[PDB]
Design a protein around this ligand. Structure first.
Ligand SMILES: O=CCc1ccccc1
Ligand SMILES: O=CCc1ccccc1
Ligand SMILES: [Cu+2]
Ligand SMILES: [Cu+2]
Ligand code: NA
Ligand code: NA
Ligand code: NA
Ligand code: NA
Lengths: 620, 620
């Protein structure tokens, strides 16, 4: 009954049937994106309408289409032909991954380049990388992928250990032409293998690790109803799944006594980008938007009990569409479990004699995705005390190159002859806020230092300053760790028992934002990543910080275009967009497979409750 | 046999006997500090000499003494009379906590102040707060505590809910005189109680939390030998305990193949300070150094299985001295256990077909201390991948005041009429480094942005810069989160297989440092807290960033005096001092008992190993 329920296989099968009968899904068509649309604002109408948005690619060169379907009514709502030179190309298709390698294998320029290096073409893997927009006029309106080559010595070999530097090719995957092959010179292919399961490299496995057993004898403390509605320790929320964004959290609310109090209407990681900092022409174009160009949800892993998720695990198995509109289940794609989280509160009082200890715990919702060499875990955490936290875990295999004789200012050495170019991993969290309802505002809070003098005779005082962001044009904000800068989302019409507006405070990690020159192509296409915080007025069609069609878009779409409307955000339905990321100078310890590194953010209540919300937690 | 073993009760009993027979421990003497001295550098002599340092207070007004004893030889090594107006007073004694309240209860000025407020003197608790150094010439060379009052309505009442604002007294605890009583006016005493175990305040306890069972069926993976020597997953270290510093880690090393490689010679939290930012004369003097003035180790809690420490716990029970030289055991004062820590590394490869997942875990060493209203957990973590992390957990009850009519720029409101002054919690970690041996250096590493232009035509390149700190005068450093600033401790004489110096990188949280005006008393006494990182040359007697005698010291002792020697630190035996802290604007959710908040730092290997050190972890 819930309009926020996960898409079913039957819904996707109906979408396929509707598209087919409307003439929109012939043999030359491919579904590049399919997802359920959220209910519109003010859906207190009980009139459920399950609508799906579809991007349709044409492999024969015809114009792609954007289509909205109503599965409830069995109709096509709208269908629009896209001009991709104007509005961007469609996301990369999984079936194009192999096309780049296959097309190059018959190109005489590519073959001549491999022959000079004595590389057997049957052993050469080609990574299908997104193209971006640079100086090549012939690429406008064409669907281009760029290929970098890696040698696999045998079928189980890790190709990443053997980059073929000095070589890149550009491919038009619709006309099936190799447009350019660039060979800047022969680099030795690094020879050491990177096979992290080879006993010769691992040595004998440790026998010292004794088991840790985590069980829940009475079962877990949370309940799941309607497929995807979670209630846990006064929290309630809906867990969604979208093929572009991955796990999406809807309707996050906290039961405070008799009242269900909303906090966040929708939370998602709405974009991520990995820009490379190597000026070599072989890689200086390299920036991949895993979310916007590749769709991270479709590469979600099936998570294994005991290995990926440990304890009393409840799984969700989301259903997505394949390229032909058939439903495909991601078995055990989302893990949900609670975890002990140490001490919650503790005090031993010298005057009352009372000794008091309580333990904390958190609810975990997570999935893992794999796109090429990189693997990412996305973790959402709910804590007993009202804190909400997000954590990204980056692992997998670093992207490699040759390490040049005489060194590099932009590449780390990992092994003899083997390099790893500097890069960043930058995320955008889209938080459709609903602090006690939809009338919200954002304030920027800085520590204020005070000078010794009258009224501060001992020079000890310090204070804080709060600045309300009133219009979109002033709501593009930068971090300032030195002044302890945070941002408070409050509801000016909902007050706590002290007559102060209720609120939540966003705590950032204050990592560097996008390092590229502001005049670069990537600074224009990933403008969201140049600032730590953006606030917009809610609008149905403003979904992604980079716009709807990221692949080969020339720039400026998304957040820079939205905020130019300069809308009122002071006590309105607003959306917070937070940029956060890792800057990665790879270390030897990252090779041949990288130990997890993490980044994230959290929100903590700030006068949202009338006192500690965990006074009713029992003594365990 | 280990010179780093914990002090035994027999050792402390021998110290008492040695002091007594030397005439140093008559009825008027009290031991204010007692601790074992670390072995001197170059102790490859097998000549064990267990020596103890003792601070001896005299309650009759005679000069205190610093005494060094050899328990191995049964002799007094040295005994020096202290001039406390010059070098500072001794730490606060536990038995002085009650003296402040008892002396005020018979002072007519104090009684007149309580009478005007209709407060029964038998219900008034007085917090014994350290005095600092301000404008009062009569306090120089005298042992002063300052008292702030709180009402306890009944013996189990939380007094912190009922501050008596507008009133402060200063007390000479040796001559037993009340030197000043300052009454700036009547504030209503806040009336709501803060009894977090009262069912009227908690409501009915939740019945929704199901148990989480963490067990180790084969026992833990670590071993403890010689009382306090830990070996765990290639790590080895000695766990010390000192009554001032608390848990101290010695000889942290990692077994890399056949080699035991040192990393850190000694790690401790060597000072902590809580400065208050309220300019009211009632509290503008308030800054307590829990470590240096009160000695956090002597107030360590006994930790309860299942509540404080959960899982398969191994306890240490350190022995300390009471004020008369009797040994006193802190039963179950230190918890040690390993914890699952999620995914360690993961990759699913599109070309090799191999799916790989490993789980992480960490070793935890922790203790909890309580000093008045505040409670702190100190956590040291060792991870499989070579990371070392420290985490402080702050909880307990916030220090309170009245909330003034018409508001405050320096105090938060928690309840009707109840305020909580702004403050910071600042820690100093002292890391006696030993990266592959004692020849170390520190480099400061900043991200470098590059301009679009020749050699960077697409404007994507970025790099990094490393600056070696060569002398103490240039080794006082500030954080810069915007440039991703970190610090690398390396050994220039020990190289990895790529011929690069081995190293470890310190990652700070980049929280604000001391906010007080640089001309303030607290900026002079806690100068360490004004900068994020200091590096000194190792010296036996340079133990604390604030000096040996913090209580009522006029300023400048410790780190500012050490670095004026301007010693060579480039490839030498060096010590890193890292300042980190929390800035606390109290929220309603912190009342009546505060949920834990955390701060810390971590060190990660940076080309210390020749490849990932966790390739030999089994598949679980
Ligand atoms: O993560 C997206 C870029 C990519 C895709 C496929 C293989 C290697 C790299
Ligand atoms: O934490 C040291 C300051 C203090 C000591 C005793 C009671 C309250 C406060
Ligand atoms: Cu990376
Ligand atoms: Cu605090
Ligand atoms: Na365009
Ligand atoms: Na909103
Ligand atoms: Na002095
Ligand atoms: Na050292």
């Amino acid at each position: 009954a819930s309009p926020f329920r996960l898409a079913s296989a039957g819904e996707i099968s109906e979408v396929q049937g509707i598209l087919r009968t409307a003439g929109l899904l012939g043999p030359e068509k491919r579904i590049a994106y399919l997802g359920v649309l959220d209910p519109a604002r003010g859906a207190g109408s009980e009139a459920e309408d399950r609508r799906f948005r579809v991007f349709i690619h044409d492999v024969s060169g015809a114009r792609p289409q954007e289509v909205t379907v109503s599965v409830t009514n069995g109709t096509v709502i709208s269908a629009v032909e896209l001009d991709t030179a104007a509005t961007g190309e469609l996301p990369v298709l999984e079936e194009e991954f192999e096309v780049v390698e296959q097309l190059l294998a018959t190109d005489e320029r590519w073959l001549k380049a491999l022959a000079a290096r004595n590389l057997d073409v049957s052993k050469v893997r080609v990574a299908p990388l997104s193209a971006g927009v640079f100086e090549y006029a012939e690429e406008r309106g064409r669907r281009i992928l760029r290929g970098l080559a890696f040698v696999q010595d045998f079928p189980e070999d890790s190709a990443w250990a053997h980059p073929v530097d000095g070589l890149v090719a550009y491919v038009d995957v619709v006309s099936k032409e190799v447009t350019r092959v660039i060979d800047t010179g022969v680099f030795p292919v690094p020879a050491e293998h990177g096979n992290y399961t080879d006993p010769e490299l691992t040595g004998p496995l440790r026998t010292t690790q004794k088991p840790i057993s985590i069980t829940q004898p009475e079962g877990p403390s949370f309940t799941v109803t309607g497929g995807n509605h979670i209630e846990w320790e006064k929290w309630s929320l809906d867990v969604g799944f979208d093929v572009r964004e991955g796990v999406v959290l809807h309707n996050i609310a906290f039961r405070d006594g008799d009242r269900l109090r909303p906090i966040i209407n929708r939370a998602s990681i709405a974009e991520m980008v990995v820009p490379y900092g190597d000026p070599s022409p072989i890689r200086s174009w390299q920036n991949y938007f895993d979310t916007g160009e590749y769709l991270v949800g479709q590469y979600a892993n099936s998570l294994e009990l005991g290995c990926d998720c440990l304890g009393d695990i409840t799984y969700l198995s989301p259903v997505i569409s394949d390229a032909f509109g058939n439903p495909r289940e991601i078995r055990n794609g989302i893990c949900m479990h609670e975890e002990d989280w140490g001490i919650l509160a503790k005090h031993s009082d010298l005057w009352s004699g009372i000794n008091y200890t309580r333990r904390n715990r958190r609810m975990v919702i997570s999935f893992f995705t794999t796109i090429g060499n990189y693997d990412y875990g996305f973790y959402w955490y709910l804590y007993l005390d009202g804190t909400i936290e997000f954590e990204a875990k980056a692992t997998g295999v670093v992207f490699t190159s040759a390490f040049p004789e005489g060194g590099s200012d932009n590449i780390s050495q990992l092994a003899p002859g083997l390099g790893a170019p500097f890069h960043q991993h930058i995320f955008s969290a889209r938080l459709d806020m609903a602090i006690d309802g939809f009338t919200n505002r954002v304030e920027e809070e800085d520590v204020v230092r005070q000078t010794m003098g009258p009224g501060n005779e001992r020079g000890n005082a310090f204070s804080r300053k709060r600045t309300v962001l009133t219009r979109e044009s002033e709501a593009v904000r930068e971090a300032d760790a030195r002044t302890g800068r945070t941002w408070i989302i409050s509801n000016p019409e909902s007050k706590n028992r002290l007559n102060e507006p209720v609120g939540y405070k966003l705590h950032a990690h204050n990592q560097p934002t996008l390092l590229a020159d502001p005049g670069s192509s990537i600074a224009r296409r990933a403008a969201f990543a140049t600032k730590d915080l953006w606030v917009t007025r809610y609008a149905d069609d403003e979904r992604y910080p980079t716009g709807d069609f990221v692949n080969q878009h020339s720039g400026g779409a998304g957040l820079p275009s939205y905020i130019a409307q300069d809308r009122d955000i002071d006590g309105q339905d607003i959306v917070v967009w937070h940029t956060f990321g890792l800057t990665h100078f790879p270390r030897v310890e990252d090779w041949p497979i990288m130990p997890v590194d993490t980044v994230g953010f959290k929100l903590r209540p700030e006068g949202f409750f009338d006192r500690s919300p965990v006074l009713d937690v029992p003594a365990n």
